[PDB]
Ligand binder design. Structure first.
Ligand SMILES: [Zn+2]
Ligand SMILES: [Zn+2]
Lengths: 353, 358
């Protein structure tokens, strides 16, 4: 199965350097400064055209049966060609820069600082993005006396998803490829998380961060994302709680007062800041970092995870999106309640009921 | 120099993370692998304007055509920021690469009501062929029969309802499992009708669908004749010069009699695409189909350059390619194609049956 070097380069290229059977990015050590042999090339069919060769991580390659020359015992032509097909569409996408403007604000933050659609368009132009059309502007409904109960949240989600479906009824979206979303939000954490749930983890989303009111640019596109410092939780019988100290440092006293006996796991960065989202790459870092720790925490108990978060709007959306794929686990979201002396108060339940 | 200079290992990484396509116009830059290739027809650009890189994720891959069309400083950096496209592009790749259960597909069988209960494709056999390729079923699977035409015949409304009917069924498969904004399943599609119908099926699924076409053979059902067989070469014969009607002939299943074309189309300027030995069984494996695509996609672009007038198509091709052919023509939105097929009640003479595009 060993094959010449130019063949290696073609296979790495056409597969975009990921293991076809499990999406592991095989350049992860280059992304920290090391060479290119973290991957194994296999033929697809049992018993020269590079289109007949798969790129695998050694972990998956070991799990495959193989003959004396290295060929597989079972045919996987379907998976390979499917994978390559997926790549082909992504790479060849026409109007790769068009995205749908999506602005979502809560009655309170629109009255103080309404984001007009034009301003999002401005930030898009500054990145080289262009607009499908007038776009979507949604205002989260003010909760009635029923508060933000289960019915309220469902109505919120539907309103978003309604507007999303309407763009697919313009033909281009319905089939072929679902359009990209230039999304920005200006509400409390629970609401924005719900917006994240609506668009979903697998959507082509381009999140924006209007943390500085009339700044319509990423602060520093060169900036490297911060390290996300994880503090695993202590043992005990208490309810498991997740603290996100990114916009600020969350006082442990405030957590336990709202959630007695909380076993606090914490994710933080060295210098918490409201403006820590220096460029979009930070968000991807957040996701990758968080996506890991969530898997670890879910393993320690099936009981709900209580979330106390101090994160910028943009991350609140992304966090909501991650949990879409993690629909096996129950999370309870706490946010500062102005009506209860700014104490953390449970407003939202995500995942299973 | 104007070009942003970079070392050899970093280039290899950029080509990889972008899968070797131009980020601004989707041109596949690996096309010289048809002959032989230095990594020379792809030019690397930085995205964010400079400030007084070991992060290579901010480096774009461009074709020379797009690279020239960007303003630039003496060092090779752009004057305007393009981070949005790049990040968008790479995310699109990542999504494709990270798709969970990448092998799930919608079984889709499409047959003519017309005839041959002898050649009835059951869902069960397609599922077998799918499992044999490492694919698994997304849902129960769809089996469609093109509606029998009324007295109006197979007019455009019939053709439109055909397109709508297929496209409808597909929308419902994603709407039962939700996630419209995400990973759309693949189509394990197979068809058993006349060429115009199968082409229309291809039009329905569209170029932008993740299609894995299967081929029905009486002796082998839906399993491939020979996964090891190498695809044939496709021999192109450019058309003669003139203003007469332009005609494209596809002689793969058989050799199309040149006179039968002229009888249906006076003065036809015949371009012809063929293989060395046209054969009924040339669809030995899916790569044959992909080869067909790659080859034909080029010549279509060339032919469109030779005229603003329609291209007339006379095809003798297996079922599977009739589908693929129909899907490709989705991308050529700027051109009109007229499809001719044998008319049995007219002594098998070619008759214009289908109009594709404006
Ligand atoms: Zn793997
Ligand atoms: Zn280009």
């Amino acid at each position: 199965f060993n094959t010449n070097d130019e063949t290696k380069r073609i296979v790495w290229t056409q597969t975009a350097g990921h293991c076809e059977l499990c999406g592991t990015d095989l350049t992860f050590d280059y992304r920290a400064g090391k060479p290119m042999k973290w991957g194994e090339v296999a033929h697809i069919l049992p018993a020269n055209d590079t289109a007949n060769l798969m790129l695998l991580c050694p972990g998956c390659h070991d799990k495959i049966d193989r003959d004396a020359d290295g060929y597989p015992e079972n045919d996987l032509s379907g998976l390979h060609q499917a994978y390559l097909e997926r790549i082909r569409l992504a790479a060849t996408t026409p109007d790769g820069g068009r995205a749908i403007p999506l602005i979502v604000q809560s009655q309170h933050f629109q009255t103080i600082n309404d984001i007009p659609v034009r301003d999002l368009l401005t930030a898009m132009s500054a990145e080289g993005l262009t607009a499908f059309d007038q776009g979507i502007k949604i205002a989260f409904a003010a909760p009635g006396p029923r508060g933000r109960d289960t019915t309220y949240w469902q109505n919120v989600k539907d309103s978003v998803q309604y507007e999303l479906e309407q763009q697919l009824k313009r033909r281009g979206g319905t089939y072929g490829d679902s359009p990209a979303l230039a999304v920005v939000g200006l509400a409390d954490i629970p609401a924005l998380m719900m917006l994240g749930q609506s668009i979903g983890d697998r959507s082509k989303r381009l999140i924006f961060s209007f943390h500085r009111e009339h700044l319509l640019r990423w602060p520093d596109q060169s900036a490297e994302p911060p390290s996300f410092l994880f503090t695993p939780p202590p043992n005990g019988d208490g309810p498991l709680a997740l603290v996100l100290s990114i916009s600020a440092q969350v006082p442990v006293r405030d957590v336990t007062d709202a959630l007695p006996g909380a076993r606090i796991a914490e994710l933080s960065i060295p210098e918490p800041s409201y403006a820590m989202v220096q460029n979009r790459r930070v968000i991807h870092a957040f996701r990758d970092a968080l996506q890991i720790r969530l898997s670890q925490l879910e393993a320690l108990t099936p009981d709900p995870i209580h979330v106390f978060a101090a994160i910028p709007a943009a991350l609140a959306i992304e966090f909501g999106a991650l949990l879409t794929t993690q629909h096996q686990h129950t999370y309870l979201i706490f946010d500062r309640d102005k009506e209860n002396q700014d104490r953390f108060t449970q407003t939202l339940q995500l995942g299973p009921v």
